[PDB]
């Protein structure tokens, strides 16, 4: 029975509005409703992994697990295995997988982050799950961010706190936050970004939604505008939105948006918005294709509609050679030529690099680079031809070309990372000098760039 080189992943996000679900929720897991929907001919084909994020979830873990498993059983005639479940307040994540994957899944981690201080600590934050699927690391974050049209900056701060403090994946990757720890990272939830148009335009917005004319609304979506201005979710992807706003509905129908200010809303307007979202970030040159992104039309117990997204994701096998794991393969090497970091920092410490990869027995520290002044004020750290030759555990090109090198640039004075990035080994050629490049981030914000050349030697 061969190991897969691709899997499909279902991502669901639903703010349940503190109400129990209706009897039937199969449309969610079938990617049926509005937007980019799944072909009917696929309805009986199970996804490999289902990741369900809820917010304002009033159910116990047991109660929701029974509903989810019975739903998937009805669709697929497969009894799915529970990988992980984790709840913070009323924010929950469930990971289910086909039984055939049980011995492919390992290193399961869960964590949560509580956002805010005092007043604003007690119901918002995030839960997450990570695991290895054969040779591929997968991370999943369900966040419920701060509500209200005039709090986009708070939502951005919630995002930065979650990616800094959520402790998932390989703890040995100490310089790296969740935005670098996984081959594929999916971040979803009630992100609570709104369509920023004047209150007086509510009926105009409703009109546009009825005509399925979303362009003038999406051009005011706060998540899209904040992402374009590099204020949040830097280096993440989102499929194009082709479904109606998923908030705020009158319950028990989808015919009416309930936007007017009420005591129950704190006298705030809730103009129709795309609160409920799925984004992802995958390592460079790894296969990831969104095959659905939409909302259900027939699940009406909440003031939000459920959102679905599905993905094809490339995965690799748990590789064994005669040599690695447990030794090097002298026939393999990774060389860096003419490398330099450009940093936005005002500081003047010396810097060194760390190279982290599961193709190495352990991480590799470089010598300090040579600081120069860049023309337009910047710090340039030159490594020249000084970088250590990296010795992978396996030399087979079928393994090595699928790997990635994480890079941290660290202060000699404090040993703190000033920037993190990632280089793919999926090169156009081996034994050939080729340009490499990554942006560098810290706490998910841009701090610099790393560029140079690579020379990869495989056993072929
Ligand atoms: C989808 C769906 N949603 O609700 C219901 C009920 C279904 C359904 O009929 N599933 C049958 C699954 C089968 C397995 C493989 C081929 C034979 C059929």
From Swiss-Prot:
Changing residue 288 to E: In one patient with acute myeloid leukemya; somatic mutation. It is found in: Cytoplasm; Cell membrane; Membrane raft; Cytoplasm, Cytoskeleton. Specifically expressed in immune and hematopoietic cells. Expressed in bone marrow and blood cells. Levels vary considerably within this compartment. Present in at least 74% of immature CD34+ cells, whereas within the more mature population of CD33+ cells, it is present in only 10% of cells. Present in the majority of T-cells, while it is present in a minority of B-cells (at protein level). Tyrosine phosphorylated by the members of the SRC family after exposure to a diverse array of extracellular stimuli such as cytokines, growth factors, antibodies, chemokines, integrin ligands and hypertonic and oxidative stress. Phosphorylated upon IgG receptor FCGR2B-binding. Signal peptide: none annotated. Interacts with tyrosine phosphorylated form of SHC1. Interacts with tyrosine phosphorylated form of DOK1. Interacts with tyrosine phosphorylated form of DOK3. Interacts with tyrosine phosphorylated form of SLAMF1/CD150. Interacts with PTPN11 in response to IL-3. Interacts with receptor EPOR. Interacts with receptors MS4A2/FCER1B and FCER1G. Interacts with receptors FCGR2B and FCGR3. Interacts with receptor FCGR2A, leading to regulate gene expression during the phagocytic process. Interacts with GRB2. Interacts with PLCG1. Interacts with tyrosine kinases SRC and TEC. Interacts with c-Met/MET. The SH2 domain interacts with tyrosine phosphorylated forms of proteins such as SHC1 or PTPN11/SHP-2. It competes with that of GRB2 for binding to phosphorylated SHC1 to inhibit the Ras pathway. It is also required for tyrosine phosphorylation. Phosphatidylinositol (PtdIns) phosphatase that specifically hydrolyzes the 5-phosphate of phosphatidylinositol-3,4,5-trisphosphate (PtdIns(3,4,5)P3) to produce PtdIns(3,4)P2, thereby negatively regulating the PI3K (phosphoinositide 3-kinase) pathways. Able also to hydrolyzes the 5-phosphate of phosphatidylinositol-4,5-bisphosphate (PtdIns(4,5)P3) and inositol 1,3,4,5-tetrakisphosphate. Acts as a negative regulator of B-cell antigen receptor signaling. Belongs to the inositol 1,4,5-trisphosphate 5-phosphatase family. This is Phosphatidylinositol 3,4,5-trisphosphate 5-phosphatase 1. The lineage of its organism: Eukaryota, Metazoa, Chordata, Craniata, Vertebrata. The chain holds residues 398 to 857 of 1189 of the full protein.
């Amino acid at each position: 029975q061969p190991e897969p080189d691709m899997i499909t992943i279902f991502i669901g996000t639903w703010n349940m509005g503190n109400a129990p679900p209706p009897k039937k929720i199969t449309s969610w897991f079938l990617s049926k409703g509005q937007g980019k929907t799944r072909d009917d001919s696929a309805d009986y084909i199970p996804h490999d992994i289902y990741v369900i994020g809820t917010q304002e979830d009033p159910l116990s873990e047991k109660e929701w697990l029974e509903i989810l498993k019975h739903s998937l059983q009805e669709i697929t005639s497969v009894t799915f295995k529970t990988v992980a479940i984790h709840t913070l307040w009323n924010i929950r994540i469930v990971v289910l997988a086909k039984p055939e994957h049980e011995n492919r899944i390992s290193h399961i981690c869960t964590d949560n982050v509580k956002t805010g201080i005092a007043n604003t600590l007690g119901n918002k934050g995030a839960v997450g799950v990570s695991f290895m699927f054969n040779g591929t690391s997968l991370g999943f974050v369900n966040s419920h961010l701060t509500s209200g049209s005039e709090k986009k900056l708070r939502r951005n701060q919630n995002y930065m706190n979650i990616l800094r403090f959520l402790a998932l994946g390989d703890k040995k990757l100490s310089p790296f936050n969740i935005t670098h720890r996984f081959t594929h990272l999916f971040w979803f939830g009630d992100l609570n970004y709104r369509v920023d148009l004047p209150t007086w335009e509510a009926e105009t917005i409703i009109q546009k939604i009825k005509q399925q004319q979303y362009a003038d609304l999406l051009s005011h979506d706060q998540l899209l505008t904040e992402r374009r201005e590099q204020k949040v979710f830097l280096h993440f992807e989102e499929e194009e939105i082709t479904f109606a706003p998923t908030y705020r509905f009158e319950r028990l129908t989808r015919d009416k948006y309930a936007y007017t200010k009420q005591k129950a809303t704190g006298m705030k307007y809730n103009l129709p918005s795309w609160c409920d979202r799925v984004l992802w970030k995958s390592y460079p040159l790894v296969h990831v294709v969104c095959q659905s992104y939409g909302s259900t039309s027939d699940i009406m117990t909440s003031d939000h509609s459920p959102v679905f997204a599905t993905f094809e994701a490339g995965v690799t096998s748990q590789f064994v050679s005669k040599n690695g794991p447990g030794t090097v393969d002298s026939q393999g090497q990774i060389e860096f030529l003419r490398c330099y970091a450009t940093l936005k920092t005002k500081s003047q410490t010396k810097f060194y690099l760390e190279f982290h990869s599961s193709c190495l027995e352990s991480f590799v520290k470089s010598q300090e680079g040579e600081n120069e002044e860049g023309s337009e004020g910047e710090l340039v750290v030159k490594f020249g031809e000084t970088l250590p030759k990296l010795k992978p555990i396996i030399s087979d090109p079928e393994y090595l070309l699928d790997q990635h090198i994480l890079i941290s640039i660290k202060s000699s004075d404090s040993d703190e990372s000033y920037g993190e990035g990632c280089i793919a080994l999926r090169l156009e050629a081996t034994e050939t000098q080729l340009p490499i490049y990554t942006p560098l981030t810290h706490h998910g914000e841009l701090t610099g760039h790393f560029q140079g050349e690579i020379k990869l030697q495989t056993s072929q």
